[PDB]
Design a protein around this ligand. Sequence first.
Ligand SMILES: CCCCCCCCCCCCCCCCCC(=O)OC[C@H](COP(=O)(O)OCCN)OC(=O)CCCCCCCCCCCCCCCCC
Lengths: 67, 142, 79, 91, 317, 96
Amino acid sequence: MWFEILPGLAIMGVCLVIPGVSTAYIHKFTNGGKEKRVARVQYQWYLMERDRRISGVNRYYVSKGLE
Amino acid sequence: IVELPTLEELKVEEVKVSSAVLKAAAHHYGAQCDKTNKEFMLCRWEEKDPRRCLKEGKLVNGCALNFFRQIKSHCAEPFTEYWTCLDYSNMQLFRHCRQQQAKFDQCVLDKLGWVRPDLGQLSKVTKVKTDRPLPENPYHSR
Amino acid sequence: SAFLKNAWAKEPVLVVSFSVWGLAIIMPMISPYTKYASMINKATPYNYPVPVRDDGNMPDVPSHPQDPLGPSLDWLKNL
Amino acid sequence: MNLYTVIFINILLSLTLILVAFWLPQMLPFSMKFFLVAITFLLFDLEIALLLPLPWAIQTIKTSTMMIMAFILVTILSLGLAYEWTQKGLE
Amino acid sequence: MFFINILTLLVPILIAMAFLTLVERKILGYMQLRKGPNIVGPYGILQPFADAMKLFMKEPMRPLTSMSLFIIAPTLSLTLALSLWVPLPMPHPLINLNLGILFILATSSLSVYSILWSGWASNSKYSLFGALRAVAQTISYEVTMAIILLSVLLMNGSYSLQTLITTQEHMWLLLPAWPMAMMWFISTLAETNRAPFDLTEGESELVSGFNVEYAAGPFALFFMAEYTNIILMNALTTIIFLGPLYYINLPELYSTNFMMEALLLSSTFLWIRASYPRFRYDQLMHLLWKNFLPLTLALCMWHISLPIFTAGVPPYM
Amino acid sequence: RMMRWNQERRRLLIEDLEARIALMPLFQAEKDRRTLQILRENLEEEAIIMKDVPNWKVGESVFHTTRWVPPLIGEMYGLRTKEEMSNANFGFTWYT
Ligand SMILES: CCCCCCCCCCCCCCCCCC(=O)OC[C@H](COP(=O)(O)OCCN)OC(=O)CCCCCCCCCCCCCCCCC
């Protein structure tokens, strides 16, 4: 019947979720489990950069009250 | 020449904590330590040069470090939980973390006695009477 | 009026088109909120509020902005 | 740079495909009416360009002014369009 | 990593792009009382790969045509389509172009060059007419397409597609602004030269002006482009107007929901094609310079006043 | 709903803008302190680069006024590592 148009769709869907799940986990892996900071405006880039300088070289590492 | 100040003149303890840490305590720091900062601002504005307010800047930093030492000593755990959750978010938005914020805010009210400043009441202009001489002829007007 | 009627039934886009043109030219003029826009946007604190020299006779916010004196946005709150 | 990296891969992927295509298989109009529409386009495009800044103007302390100014922009151009119709230019 | 994130977001879309043609040649089929392609492979799954290989193997005829432009137009087409998928705001978008919607609008406009140049390069009368007709309709639908977005943005506060995920945390922008959704949907149908608006390659009226002379590999690249676009524009409808649910803790839900809505609206233009005859050229443009453009202009005003008189100006973050 | 949501969203926006309003004083000091260091550090190398050059005032305001003219980006990072300069110059246009 119409049962059969589903096979094809399944392979479309599966190929349209990969991208959204992929981009959203290759970010939380590269950024240390914390969402990649979105620096829309400079202030944010400043804060981000400030973070880099604060520790290691990468901003994702985040020092706390114990420092 | 340029009369650039010397390093020893500009070496002072550093806050160095992740920006996230600050944003979480931002409100309280805007509260417990705006006396010196406002004065420093006054100097840095009327007196355009930075060299003319360096010492004030040192005072600016000193005020915050202890601000942190107090929190480290008391209600450190709450603050630790609040910043970690705040840091995970990409724009470190305040509303994703309100449950952690409440426990951090309530505790320091309970122990430190400080208070989270209500919506606003930080943006409003402040009057600080810097005993420094209100400068004149700035920009070596000639 | 009669044409208006047919216009409502023939070429019923322009009618709607104009109607909106007007309704957008009226609501702003009559609105318990129109005033807020210029305030709500005015208030947003984009730029730093440089302090003022406490020379004397100052009714301004007394130092710590937590002090009572000063402007308030409780209007924004509970809006 | 990140964008540059993505885009050059994008062109590369295409150029690769066209090449494969060629290398693998070895084995007078009178659009006067249109012309007019085209010009209006140019004009309307420009208006739109003057309407693009709104997203930041909505923030203007001078909200009222922005309203009046903006409203005028759309209205005036709307009139231009209507004229086209009134003069039956487009038709 | 970032490279891996380029394979994903590309291949996955290309593989999905292939499966759309199949779900087009079966959904159109069942609507017309026929099974559609099921004999090659299981249930026709290998069918898209099969003609791709035939198309590339068949000779790329070079008519006795400006070669450079003739060959470039296909390249531009695919380049643009794949590029427009870079800033889409599925969770944690590949690239947070701050002015993304503008970027989308920009690249979308550049595509017109391909059809125009293709027709001019082809040097065939049919192709020439196709280009002229195409450029006109394309650009015109761009004029309402852009204004419809400007109305949206003013209620979103920014050009960044990422903001709408925070704008649509309580209600879809269809409820408000539905009148434009429809007008965005019809414009999305025109800009992908799909059926109701497919005078670019009417085939019956004029015979595929865009690719009259294009065959094999060039045919395929635009071809691929069109279908990827078919998805992209539908996906933009599924972010701008139908806002999928989103949870910072679980970012996947968005993608999954984004999937479902994109597939259904992609299914809709497939369903539109079989269901409607094709608009005439004059009729098409009238609808936009006459039936819609006045509607789109007026609501723009309403959406300018709305925030102010409702003191609903959006945050600029 | 849109009216109420954006009014709420506006409240959140004023809250975090004020959060930096409070924190910028700490940063302003930090920036200046570091800025001067870069200028001075460049002075050291400056006092070691053109020493041999005749008629070479180690350094002198390109201008006549003694007013404090802020340091261009180039001046701060010009002598420094190329990457350092590039970062500052093309480091925002290129997102995180
Ligand atoms: C008060 C505050 C401000 C708000 C005011 C709101 C007032 C109420 C809303 C009024 C406008 C509602 C409709 C908006 C879109 C339609 C605009 C329009 O006028 O239609 C033009 C045209 C029909 O015109 P025609 O029949 O030729 O006659 C013209 C007579 N003047 O339309 C067409 O011919 C379209 C042809 C389409 C062919 C394909 C159809 C596909 C149908 C299925 C998909 C429909 C869209 C799905 C969208 C999903 C979500 C994106």
